[PDB]
Amino acid sequence: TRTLPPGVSDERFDAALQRFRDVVGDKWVLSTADELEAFRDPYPVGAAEANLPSAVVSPESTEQVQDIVRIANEYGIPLSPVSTGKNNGYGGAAPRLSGSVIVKTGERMNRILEVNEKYGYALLEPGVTYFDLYEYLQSHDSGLMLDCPDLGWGSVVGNTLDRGVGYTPYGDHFMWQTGLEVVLPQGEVMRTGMGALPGSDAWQLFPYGFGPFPDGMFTQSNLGIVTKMGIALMQRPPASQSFLITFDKEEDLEQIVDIMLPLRINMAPLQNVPVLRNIFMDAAAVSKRTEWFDGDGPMPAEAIERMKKDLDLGFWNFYGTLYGPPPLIEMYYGMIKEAFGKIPGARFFTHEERDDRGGHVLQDRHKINNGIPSLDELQLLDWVPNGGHIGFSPVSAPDGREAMKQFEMVRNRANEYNKDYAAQFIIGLREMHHVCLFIYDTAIPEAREEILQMTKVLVREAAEAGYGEYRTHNALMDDVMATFNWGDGALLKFHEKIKDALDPNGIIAPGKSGIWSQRFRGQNL
Amino acid sequence: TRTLPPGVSDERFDAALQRFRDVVGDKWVLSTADELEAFRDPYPVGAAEANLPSAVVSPESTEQVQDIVRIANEYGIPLSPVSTGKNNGYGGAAPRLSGSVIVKTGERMNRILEVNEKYGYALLEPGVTYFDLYEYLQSHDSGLMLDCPDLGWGSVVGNTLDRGVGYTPYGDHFMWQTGLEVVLPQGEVMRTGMGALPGSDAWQLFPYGFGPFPDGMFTQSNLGIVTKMGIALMQRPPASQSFLITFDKEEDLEQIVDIMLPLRINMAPLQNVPVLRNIFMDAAAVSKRTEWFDGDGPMPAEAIERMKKDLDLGFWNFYGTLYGPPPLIEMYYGMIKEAFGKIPGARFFTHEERDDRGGHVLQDRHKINNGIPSLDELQLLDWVPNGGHIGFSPVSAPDGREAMKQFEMVRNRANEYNKDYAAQFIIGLREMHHVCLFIYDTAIPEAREEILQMTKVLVREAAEAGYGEYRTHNALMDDVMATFNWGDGALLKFHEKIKDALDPNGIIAPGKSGIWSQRFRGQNL
Numbered sequence A, B: 001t002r003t004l005p006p007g008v009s010d011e012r013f014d015a016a017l018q019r020f021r022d023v024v025g026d027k028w029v030l031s032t033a034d035e036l037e038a039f040r041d042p043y044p045v046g047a048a049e050a051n052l053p054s055a056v057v058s059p060e061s062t063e064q065v066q067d068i069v070r071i072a073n074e075y076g077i078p079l080s081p082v083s084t085g086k087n088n089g090y091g092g093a094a095p096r097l098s099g100s101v102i103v104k105t106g107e108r109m110n111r112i113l114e115v116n117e118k119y120g121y122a123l124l125e126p127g128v129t130y131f132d133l134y135e136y137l138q139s140h141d142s143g144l145m146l147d148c149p150d151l152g153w154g155s156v157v158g159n160t161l162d163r164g165v166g167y168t169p170y171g172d173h174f175m176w177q178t179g180l181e182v183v184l185p186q187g188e189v190m191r192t193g194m195g196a197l198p199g200s201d202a203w204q205l206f207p208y209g210f211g212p213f214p215d216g217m218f219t220q221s222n223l224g225i226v227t228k229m230g231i232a233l234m235q236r237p238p239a240s241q242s243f244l245i246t247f248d249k250e251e252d253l254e255q256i257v258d259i260m261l262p263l264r265i266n267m268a269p270l271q272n273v274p275v276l277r278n279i280f281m282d283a284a285a286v287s288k289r290t291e292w293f294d295g296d297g298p299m300p301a302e303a304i305e306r307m308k309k310d311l312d313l314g315f316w317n318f319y320g321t322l323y324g325p326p327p328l329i330e331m332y333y334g335m336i337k338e339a340f341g342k343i344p345g346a347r348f349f350t351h352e353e354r355d356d357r358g359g360h361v362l363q364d365r366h367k368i369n370n371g372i373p374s375l376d377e378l379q380l381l382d383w384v385p386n387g388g389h390i391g392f393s394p395v396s397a398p399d400g401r402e403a404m405k406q407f408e409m410v411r412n413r414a415n416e417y418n419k420d421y422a423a424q425f426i427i428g429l430r431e432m433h434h435v436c437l438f439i440y441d442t443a444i445p446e447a448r449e450e451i452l453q454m455t456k457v458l459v460r461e462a463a464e465a466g467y468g469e470y471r472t473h474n475a476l477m478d479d480v481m482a483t484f485n486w487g488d489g490a491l492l493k494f495h496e497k498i499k500d501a502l503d504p505n506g507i508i509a510p511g512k513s514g515i516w517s518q519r520f521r522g523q524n525l
């Protein structure tokens, strides 16, 4: 059947599309089941179909975003903005609420507006991918580097707006975000920070402006459609050196993290954002599962040994990168070797030393950590046929007991539901994003529902232990937000109150982060 | 003439007062003419009496704060929260709306809830001063250091919630803020970040939590009353060295800023937040105006030169600090010598190299830049009888040309109105806070009036030229917010719609940052 928006008839919906076409042109509104199949979640979760868009609209400018919002308010059409819509692992381009219209801001609004070499910033529209920006910086002989995620096909803006992470010293994307322009839910356009001051050259220079600081309210949020965003760019250092440390035992995690913290807290000698990847995660980047095991259920421990042997890796695999003058790189590599040396069976490789099949990730990290975007990590999805992943992304203290507790908790449930648990601890100064990627066969209905059931259990099992997620899939947003329920759900009530006063007709991305407008609360979609 | 909240009678006010005492006890409700004397703006601005409190309420817990708020909603009585109320230069403790009740949270809410050595953070009630925290740290033989402003009598929370700044690498106080508890305008209580998840250890570990990140909206804000705040604390480095560079000419400014930027933008070799102070700023810290020129008018150049000659200082004076093992310090001081030694007349000193009187400022910077709080900059108020200051604090791009244009513009008005211009450029990564202190006799009502009218001119002339203020005085709050009027005042309409959703009855510090709730809009207050 035709996907229509909640409470909107065929007749009123065809009026609504015609008006979108008036604004953007007829080629830039997509409305047929065929055309829309490309905007389904590529990695669907649950057996029952969900998150189905009713149309895709691609505006060329801010002026058109506004007119689209107005139309959507007049007609009661929920809108779900994206940049490039590559939020794979969290829903793709697919909207939380079935029947929403996707506003793909990145199709046509993809200009790099300014890259200022002197102040080390860039002003970007939301269609600028990491590749685009990288390509610009190469062409103009730039002395700046971008900070990217594992996959560079996503948007600098879109990724920042979901508080994604990268791996250079500028890994925390939202921290370095500086000013933004946004269309609010009734059509008004606003600029934050020093951009509210007309004629200011400080919009990308000073983030805060004057009065309350609102920029975070437009992250993981449905409070507006962002049309421009600035971001600081780090200077390319004179030299770098990436390294791998392999650790043999699963139980080495505790000690790894406890040794790490005093070296990370000060941003030296661990200058970048280290990553501790388990063997399923590294194996999956270079090989298929049927190369190690072709039986049923959890990979047995002898098969885990073959992966570690052939590829010459540990169960745990620490990847890091150092930057600066060559005498500094060596001092710091020296300190790191001394500390992690304690762990029996720890082995060290720099990016110069290792160039085999197992080294393919080290070589990939050394690109990423030097702000060169890659698609090498797409190979992960060939672990099994019709491969897809979901992100279960709890936050952990930089404490080996907490991490070992989370690891065992997750593994206990991943084996119970027959899913392989690829693990990647991404390590900040004071906390760790514990990304648990469960890779699975998207074709099979039972694999998908087991993924959904399994992750619903872990959200609740994690919350009961005091752990929360930093980011989650469409299908888990209500469940995740339901865990942030201190003071009788105070945080949610606050968010719903702001939502209702900026978005009286409940128009922008309803359900995002479990925040629904008055008119959807209680309906269970 | 007895001060009362707008449209509240003597008896309705009496009953409210009585209810406040029920909540907090008798001792902690001040309401008599000269009890409240101490809560007037200590550096009054304008000849007319503005900014008059009707009462002061000192609660001891979050619960009393919630109740006080509920009672204020019942009566329509404005509340003006402070921490320690030492916001001098901007209004001190005094409220923006005359008739509001001060809620001095810090008087009894002054516990250091936790200092964690492992993860390098603190959890604090509003009453912890920088002296108190430093005393905790000395007692416990801590590895951590704080980041303090010029005057350490203020609160860690108060300063942070006004987006204040200190001078260690952790200088940007708001960015090292992590997690807070807040009472919202109708008495609901809410924890931000991971604090919203019952039993999390991660409140002071991961700031963002999940979904929209609101912490920024409680800074320069009137959206709640803050009861707890977390802040990250830097590790104390093994050694340190501070340095003064003097630049003899007034014109060297342009060249000093242009050389500074590449040495600062990557936090190395300028690691700390450098300051560029003029001779006026530094003289007043060590001497009275009458030592150099007894006279009604602006200070002649021959008096400027004697100041420089006796104190052995330049017109522009550059104060920085280096941290790390002694080899790294020698390296980085090396590079700083060679870069700023391009400027003619420029002379260098370290903290070991000066015991004279002009050097007392360097010794005060060497404490502050190492997180040793101080009150030496109080001597600044001696400069003239009954000294007070006000802060006009424009943001500048870290560009020499833009820093001379702001300097001359400000100097011209300083001379026209007969006020001395003390200047300190506080230098971030990509921006500068250009802080202009104008010192004056607060007893003379013409001088108070010259100040208000002068800064009113300055705010308007600075915005015409493309510059906004980071922070401002009660006096200037409406005028500063009118300058950020991009999009037909798009920013202010936004802040008001949010204010009016969370505070239907217009209770919390109305007028703060030029943001007035519905019941006060379009009025002369």
Ligand SMILES: *Cc1cc2c(cc1C)nc1c(=O)[nH]c(=O)nc-1n2C[C@H](O)[C@H](O)[C@H](O)COP(=O)(O)OP(=O)(O)OC[C@H]1O[C@@H](n2cnc3c(N)ncnc32)[C@H](O)[C@@H]1O
Pocket: A081, A082, A083, A084, A085, A086, A087, A088, A089, A092, A093, A105, A126, A148, A149, A150, A151, A153, A154, A155, A156, A157, A158, A159, A161, A162, A163, A164, A165, A166, A221, A224, A225, A226, A227, A377, A378, A380, A389, A512
């Ligand atoms: C499968 C996978 C995913 C992945 C990864 C590795 C693998 C194998 N590694 C990642 C990493 O290192 N870091 C990271 O942050 N994410 C990683 N992912 C997940 C994901 O693919 C990436 O984050 C990707 O960059 C996100 O997609 P994109 O960049 O295209 O973002 P989007 O889909 O357009 O938007 C994301 C959400 O933000 C809100 N949004 C976006 N644009 C707007 C505008 N203009 N206005 C308002 N809100 C906006 C929407 O909620 C949108 O869904």
Ligand SMILES: *Cc1cc2c(cc1C)nc1c(=O)[nH]c(=O)nc-1n2C[C@H](O)[C@H](O)[C@H](O)COP(=O)(O)OP(=O)(O)OC[C@H]1O[C@@H](n2cnc3c(N)ncnc32)[C@H](O)[C@@H]1O
Pocket: B081, B082, B083, B084, B085, B086, B087, B088, B089, B092, B093, B105, B126, B148, B149, B150, B151, B153, B154, B155, B156, B157, B158, B159, B161, B162, B163, B164, B165, B166, B220, B221, B224, B225, B226, B227, B377, B378, B380, B389, B509, B512
């Ligand atoms: C005269 C002067 C001032 C000064 C300075 C040097 C001199 C000679 N140097 C400064 C510096 O180096 N850095 C800096 O940030 N400020 C400097 N100043 C200005 C001032 O002295 C300090 O900022 C001072 O520490 C601030 O005072 P305090 O810490 O006591 O904060 P407060 O007066 O209580 O309140 C500040 C404002 O924040 C909001 N606020 C405060 N508490 C709350 C709660 N609990 N809830 C909600 N909002 C709150 C209020 O708006 C309040 O006015």
Ligand SMILES: COc1cc(C=O)ccc1O
Pocket: A088, A089, A090, A150, A164, A165, A390, A391, A392, A393, A424, A435, A437, A471
């Ligand atoms: C599934 O989403 C994520 C994936 C990764 C790396 O593979 C890092 C952070 C994420 O949020």
Ligand SMILES: COc1cc(C=O)ccc1O
Pocket: B088, B089, B090, B150, B390, B391, B393, B424, B435, B471
């Ligand atoms: C009164 O305002 C300020 C004063 C100072 C003095 O060093 C620094 C920052 C400020 O905002």
